Design an enzyme around this catalytic site. Structure first.
Site, mmCIF file in Angstrom:
data_model
loop_
_atom_site.group_PDB
_atom_site.id
_atom_site.type_symbol
_atom_site.label_atom_id
_atom_site.label_comp_id
_atom_site.label_asym_id
_atom_site.label_seq_id
_atom_site.Cartn_x
_atom_site.Cartn_y
_atom_site.Cartn_z
ATOM 1 N N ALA A 10 0.728 -4.571 0.654
ATOM 2 C CA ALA A 10 0.930 -6.046 0.699
ATOM 3 C C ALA A 10 -0.355 -6.747 1.158
ATOM 4 C CB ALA A 10 2.123 -6.438 1.586
ATOM 5 N N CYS A 11 -0.905 -7.611 0.289
ATOM 6 C CA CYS A 11 -2.215 -8.248 0.502
ATOM 7 C C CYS A 11 -2.108 -9.782 0.416
ATOM 8 C CB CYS A 11 -3.218 -7.741 -0.551
ATOM 9 S SG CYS A 11 -4.881 -8.406 -0.378
ATOM 10 N N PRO A 12 -2.811 -10.535 1.332
ATOM 11 C CA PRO A 12 -2.922 -12.020 1.251
ATOM 12 C C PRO A 12 -3.769 -12.489 0.040
ATOM 13 C CG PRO A 12 -4.385 -11.164 2.964
ATOM 14 C CD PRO A 12 -3.517 -10.010 2.541
#
Length: 108
Positions: A10-12
């Site tokens: 999970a990445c911004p």
């Protein structure tokens, strides 16, 4: 028997970065012999969605994240090895084989 591994990248930044972490952890877990299923969450969307079954089968889980994943609640009850999404890229093989020998050591 046939054991199982899953992960969550999970990445911004989005799904491109999660796919580098996904590909990395996947190769590592394939060399470990068992199954591997990695869900990827980002600002673009969610890919390779885990099922309730995938998370149950999962002898090993890796939350390779940089932000709190929207689906983290499904893994709340389960044994998760929560790291950085960057560690998933640089240390992919290291992560998997270390969890393998930690679990194996206490399972002996």
């Amino acid at each position: 028997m046939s054991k199982k591994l899953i992960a969550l990248c999970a990445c911004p930044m989005g799904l491109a970065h999660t796919f580098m972490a996904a590909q990395a952890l996947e190769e590592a877990a394939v060399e470990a012999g068992y199954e591997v299923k990695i869900e990827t969450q980002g600002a673009d969307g969610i890919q390779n969605r885990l099922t309730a079954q995938d998370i149950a089968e999962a002898t090993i889980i890796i939350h390779s994240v940089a932000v709190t994943p929207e689906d983290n609640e499904r893994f709340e009850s389960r044994d998760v090895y929560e790291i950085t999404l960057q560690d998933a890229i640089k240390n992919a093989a290291g992560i998997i084989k270390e969890i393998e020998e930690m679990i194996a050591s206490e399972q002996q």
